[PDB]
Write an enzyme that holds these catalytic residues in place. Structure first.
Site, mmCIF file in Angstrom:
data_model
loop_
_atom_site.group_PDB
_atom_site.id
_atom_site.type_symbol
_atom_site.label_atom_id
_atom_site.label_comp_id
_atom_site.label_asym_id
_atom_site.label_seq_id
_atom_site.Cartn_x
_atom_site.Cartn_y
_atom_site.Cartn_z
ATOM 1 N N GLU A 268 0.603 -1.053 0.111
ATOM 2 C CA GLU A 268 0.006 -0.103 -0.163
ATOM 3 C C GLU A 268 0.629 1.324 -0.041
ATOM 4 O OE1 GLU A 268 0.285 -2.264 2.711
ATOM 5 O OE2 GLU A 268 0.238 -1.151 4.714
ATOM 6 N N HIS A 301 -8.127 -3.927 -0.859
ATOM 7 C CA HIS A 301 -7.248 -4.237 0.315
ATOM 8 C C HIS A 301 -6.038 -2.828 0.380
ATOM 9 C CE1 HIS A 301 -5.212 -6.185 3.759
ATOM 10 N NE2 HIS A 301 -4.221 -5.555 3.177
ATOM 11 N N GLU A 302 -5.377 -2.775 -0.702
ATOM 12 C CA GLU A 302 -4.272 -1.663 -0.802
ATOM 13 C C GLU A 302 -5.027 -0.613 -0.937
ATOM 14 O OE1 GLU A 302 -1.931 -3.412 0.216
ATOM 15 O OE2 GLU A 302 -2.113 -5.329 -0.674
ATOM 16 N N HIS A 305 -6.083 0.709 2.887
ATOM 17 C CA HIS A 305 -5.000 1.013 3.658
ATOM 18 C C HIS A 305 -4.850 2.453 3.468
ATOM 19 C CE1 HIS A 305 -3.261 -2.595 5.451
ATOM 20 N NE2 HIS A 305 -2.897 -3.011 4.429
HETATM 21 C C1 LIG Z 1 1.770 -11.266 4.172
HETATM 22 C C2 LIG Z 1 0.456 -11.588 4.351
HETATM 23 C C3 LIG Z 1 -0.088 -12.311 5.419
HETATM 24 C C4 LIG Z 1 -1.168 -12.890 5.601
HETATM 25 C C5 LIG Z 1 -2.337 -12.402 4.735
HETATM 26 C C6 LIG Z 1 -2.100 -11.789 3.683
HETATM 27 C C7 LIG Z 1 -0.702 -11.436 3.310
HETATM 28 N N1 LIG Z 1 -0.474 -10.878 2.191
HETATM 29 C C8 LIG Z 1 0.132 -9.592 1.559
HETATM 30 O O1 LIG Z 1 0.122 -9.341 0.457
HETATM 31 N N2 LIG Z 1 0.429 -8.642 2.705
HETATM 32 C C9 LIG Z 1 0.621 -7.479 2.432
HETATM 33 C C10 LIG Z 1 1.933 -7.479 3.395
HETATM 34 C C11 LIG Z 1 2.824 -6.395 2.887
HETATM 35 C C12 LIG Z 1 3.993 -5.957 4.102
HETATM 36 C C13 LIG Z 1 3.730 -6.591 1.714
HETATM 37 C C14 LIG Z 1 -0.328 -6.313 2.897
HETATM 38 O O2 LIG Z 1 -1.210 -6.646 3.799
HETATM 39 N N3 LIG Z 1 -0.574 -5.630 2.127
HETATM 40 O O3 LIG Z 1 -1.552 -4.451 2.314
HETATM 41 ZN ZN LIG Z 2 -2.420 -4.903 4.170
#
Ligand SMILES: Cc1ccccc1NC(=O)N[C@H](CC(C)C)C(=O)NO
Ligand SMILES: [Zn+2]
Ligand SMILES: [Mg+2]
Ligand SMILES: [Mg+2]
Ligand SMILES: [Mg+2]
Length: 890
Positions: A268, A301-302, A305
């Site tokens: 994000e 989701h992004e 955020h």
């Molecule tokens: C890593 C992970 C753990 C549990 C559930 C889903 C995710 N996937 C992400 O893409 N997460 C990204 C993390 C980011 C630090 C790259 C995220 O929440 N994007 O907003």
């Molecule tokens: Zn996230």
């Protein structure tokens, strides 16, 4: 190992107000010059100034234009830069560094790295320190002025966060661009991208303030045709946050960028969201159906955020669930709205109760707000995300929409432009709760136990009906098993959404209501209940708990047929299956362990089978729902209910149940497979990348589920159907043809046919890999070696490695081969991968999380491979911490 504790949080002695970066990309090095405009905070006690900085080659360091020298004014140990306190100014000062980094050799995909021909960053959580020196923690908020320079022909598009304020030529075929991001942020939200990127764009006008926003989506040129659905999903996400939350975007431009090499789904970064290409790119001729939902959810989701994470950020990493739980909740509300299908919420429940419940009964169990860590990156977990989202959703259940929106707005406004903690959220929700109860002494202090207490509560029920009084009672008990985090578990605030169904006519007997269980046990009584009801409990899966309905199978069948709530109907079916699975499992286990010559099996309930047939033949029932009821619960759900599980016995149990049902229903399955074809495979919208019919998608899912069942059954002449299915224009169908052909001699012909259809699109080839990997083949180990040698080869692309290996690890019979050969193959992959990408290596450990749930021979085999991994020289801190915790040494 070095341990961080939530209780020891303290604000920094320093403040970083402005960051001015020059990032000069060359073929064999990137030079990063950085000026930090800094100051001393009110918390300063004259300490050394210590920056994080990992793997940086120092060219120069200065403060107020005084060069500092190694050994004299500073030390650097390739992790921490320490400036001795005598040389740290007592008021505002300028800290300057110039370092050299090497994105072209960064195969860990954290910091600044090369992905094919694109240079890209990933800074969350600890990656910015691999780019330049910083006090790399999310409470250090600053404003950023970023210049990027590079060769023009190779890197014609240069992006960083915020407004592009200048673009310029540089001698020697180079060029530069300068960015200003006006919004204060933590360094984890910094991003840069340089590449030969192509785009689609559109203009979005904000709902309330009518701000014009330019929306850009970017990929490599080969795949620019795959951008449109993402752009459409971004427009949908923006409208959703305006419509539900009243939240508008806050910059003149938003860029989304796809890269081939990415550790997780997307990120994000402010104004510059960066995605795994598998979570941004699709086309209807080159992607399976599930891509469309995945892109919708990840873009959403992004986007969400932007407020829950960016405009309100985290005080410290222990608060991770405050942005991730909350954003997943927002993403789920969005997804449910956009798809309008009941299977959306069911899919979220299935994910929690399989993978997250396993995690929560494992030695890895943590509360959604952990008390400690070594590698923060190991706490990006389904607990923090998915249990966190259910905790964030329970507020909505408790408050209702109107008062939920009020609380959320208190939170988002109060903490705008600042950091926040889980307490701040709970406090806002508690203000709304006071208003809803019209009682300024109501409080949500008990609610905080959902952030601090690990483990999954078990909720159980007893019922009584008094016919003379027309009075019904529901007696409810909650228990959470003690664990390594709490020896004594306290009762939680559990919202129980309930209905009451009249079994004689199938109709609702009460206005739906939400019971608020706050004690270890309570009895809820209902008057004017005209006949003995069947209760419909935890509607919508109203809390993240194990439910013990104490209903008969006859009562469960009545709910499956007649209740209004999709989750209850589904869970009633799930429960009938679980009772059968546990009974047959115990029958097979005793037979195996006592070496019996003959024994009995409990048949599947005939009235349940009749109920499945009634549902499937109802042309007005939902196709997605039907696909959930013909499928047994996932193995990772079942394992939560069995100790010392013998995987081969389980496989035999599942096969017996499926065969019992198909022996009754296969003709029904066949008739439906044919009848659904016309609507399922209609080509309306096949050229329209802005619109998906999710109902029609669920019809394809149902067809493909039925085809699997019929193929495993060897239903007569089904091979004809499989061959026809392979000619379908929909990749979901033609890849299904390969999977289901596993049971026939035609599998290698379809393997080649589908390979040829897949090999010229990077992401479709990855979907083909997964389809091969998950294939129910007795020769799967020889097939994996063929994939390794012919297709995967030396790839360091996490999507290729995950595609080859993860699906195969879900093969219950073959991965858990009693020789241990499955455990050994995956442990070798993990160790190989750890030498260049520790985050992906830890992902590949997933199958081992259930080790202490298996029979004792398999426990020993898995443990031996985990300890072998732990012995590997130069094991990463990420992997070592994960494995120490998982094996009860940490
Ligand atoms: C890593 C992970 C753990 C549990 C559930 C889903 C995710 N996937 C992400 O893409 N997460 C990204 C993390 C980011 C630090 C790259 C995220 O929440 N994007 O907003
Ligand atoms: Zn996230
Ligand atoms: Mg380096
Ligand atoms: Mg999701
Ligand atoms: Mg590749």
């Amino acid at each position: 190992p070095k341990i961080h504790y939530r209780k020891d949080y303290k604000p920094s002695g320093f403040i970083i107000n402005n960051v001015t970066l020059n990032i000069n990309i060359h073929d064999n090095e990137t030079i990063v010059r950085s000026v930090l405009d800094m100051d001393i905070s009110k918390h300063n006690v004259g300490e050394d100034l210590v920056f994080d900085g990992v793997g940086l080659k120092i060219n120069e360091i200065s403060i107020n234009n005084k060069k500092l020298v190694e050994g004299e004014e500073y030390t650097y140990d390739n992790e921490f830069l320490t400036i001795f306190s005598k040389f740290v100014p007592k008021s505002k000062f300028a800290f300057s560094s110039e370092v050299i980094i090497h994105p072209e050799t960064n195969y860990a995909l954290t910091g600044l790295y090369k992905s094919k021909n694109i240079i890209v960053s990933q800074c969350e959580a600890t990656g910015f320190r691999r780019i330049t020196f910083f006090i790399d923690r999310p409470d250090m908020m600053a404003k950023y002025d970023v210049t990027v320079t590079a060769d023009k022909e190779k890197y014609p598009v240069l992006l960083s966060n915020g407004d592009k304020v200048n673009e310029f030529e540089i001698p020697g075929g180079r060029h530069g661009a300068r960015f200003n991001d006006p919004h204060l942020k933590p360094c984890y939200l910094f991003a840069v991208v340089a590449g030969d990127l192509k785009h689609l764009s559109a203009t979005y006008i904000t709902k309330y303030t009518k701000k014009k926003v330019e929306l850009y989506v970017f990929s490599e040129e080969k795949y620019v045709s795959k951008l449109q659905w993402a752009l459409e999903c971004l427009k949908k996400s923006m409208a959703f946050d305006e419509d539900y939350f009243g939240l508008e975007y806050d910059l003149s431009r938003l860029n989304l960028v796809a890269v081939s090499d990415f550790n997780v789904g997307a990120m994000e970064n402010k104004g510059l969201n960066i995605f795994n290409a598998n979570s941004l790119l699709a086309s209807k001729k080159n992607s399976i159906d599930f891509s469309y939902a995945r892109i919708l959810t990840v873009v959403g989701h992004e986007y969400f955020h932007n407020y829950t994470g960016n405009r309100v950020t985290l005080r410290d990493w222990f608060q991770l669930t405050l942005k991730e739980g909350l954003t997943v909740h927002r993403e789920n509300l969005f997804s449910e709205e956009m798809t309008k299908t009941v299977t959306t919420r069911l899919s979220h429940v299935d994910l929690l109760r399989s993978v997250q419940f396993l995690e929560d009964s494992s030695p890895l169990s943590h509360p959604i707000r952990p008390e400690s860590y070594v590698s923060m990156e190991n706490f990006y977990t389904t607990t923090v995300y998915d249990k966190g989202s259910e905790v964030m959703r329970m507020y909505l259940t408790i408050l209702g929409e109107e008062y939920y929106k009020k609380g959320f707005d208190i939170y988002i406004k109060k903490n705008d432009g600042n950091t926040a903690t889980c307490e701040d959220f709970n406090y806002a929700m508690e203000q709304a709760y006071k208003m809803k109860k019209a009682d300024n002494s109501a409080n949500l202090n008990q609610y905080l136990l959902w952030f601090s207490q690990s483990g999954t509560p078990h909720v159980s029920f007893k019922y009584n009906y008094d016919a003379e009084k027309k009075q019904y009672s529901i007696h409810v008990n909650q228990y959470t098993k003690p664990d390594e985090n709490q020896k004594e578990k306290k009762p939680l605030f559990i919202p129980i959404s309930v209905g009451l169904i009249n079994p004689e006519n199938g109709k609702e007997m009460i206005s739906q209501t939400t019971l608020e269980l706050t004690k270890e046990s309570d009895t809820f009584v209902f008057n004017n209940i005209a006949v003995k009801p069947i209760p419909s409990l935890f509607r919508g899966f109203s809390a993240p708990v194990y439910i013990e309905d104490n209903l008969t199978d006859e009562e469960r069948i009545l709910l499956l047929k007649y209740d209004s709530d999709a989750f209850v109907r589904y869970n009633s079916c799930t429960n009938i299956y679980m009772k059968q699975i546990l009974m047959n499992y115990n029958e097979f286990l005793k037979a195996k362990n006592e070496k019996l010559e003959s024994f009995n099996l409990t048949p599947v309930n005939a009235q349940f089978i009749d109920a499945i047939k009634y549902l499937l033949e109802d042309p007005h029932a939902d196709a997605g729902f039907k696909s959930y009821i013909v499928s047994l619960p996932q193995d990772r759900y079942i394992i939560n209910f069995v100790s010392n599980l013998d995987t081969d016995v389980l496989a035999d149990t599942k096969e017996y149940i499926y065969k019992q049902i198909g022996d009754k229903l296969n003709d029904v399955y066949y008739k439906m497979f044919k009848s659904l074809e016309a609507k399922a495979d209609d080509l309306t919208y096949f050229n329209d990348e802005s619109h998906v019919d999710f109902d029609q998608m669920n019809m394809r899912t149902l067809r493909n589920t039925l085809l699997s069942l019929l193929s495993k059954a060897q239903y007569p002449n089904i091979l004809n159907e499989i061959i026809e299915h392979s000619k379908s224009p929909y990749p979901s169908n033609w890849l299904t043809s390969l999977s289901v052909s596993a049971y026939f001699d035609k599998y290698f012909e379809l393997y080649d046919k589908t390979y040829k259809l897949s090999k010229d699109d990077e992401l479709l080839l990855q979907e083909w890999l997964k389809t091969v990997s998950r294939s129910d083949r007795k020769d799967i180990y020889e097939i994996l070696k063929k994939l390794e040698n012919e297709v995967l080869k030396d790839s360091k692309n996490p999507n290729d490695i995950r595609a080859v290996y993860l699906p195969f690890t879900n093969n219950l019979r073959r991965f858990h081969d009693i020789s241990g050969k499955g455990y050994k193959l995956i442990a070798e992959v993990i160790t190989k991968t750890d030498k260049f990408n520790p985050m992906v290596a830890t992902q590949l450990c997933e199958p081992f999380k259930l080790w202490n749930k298996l029979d004792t021979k398999r426990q020993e085999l898995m443990l031996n491979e985990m300890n072998t991994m732990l012995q590997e020289p130069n094991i990463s801190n990420n992997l070592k911490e994960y494995l120490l915790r998982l094996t009860n040494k940490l």
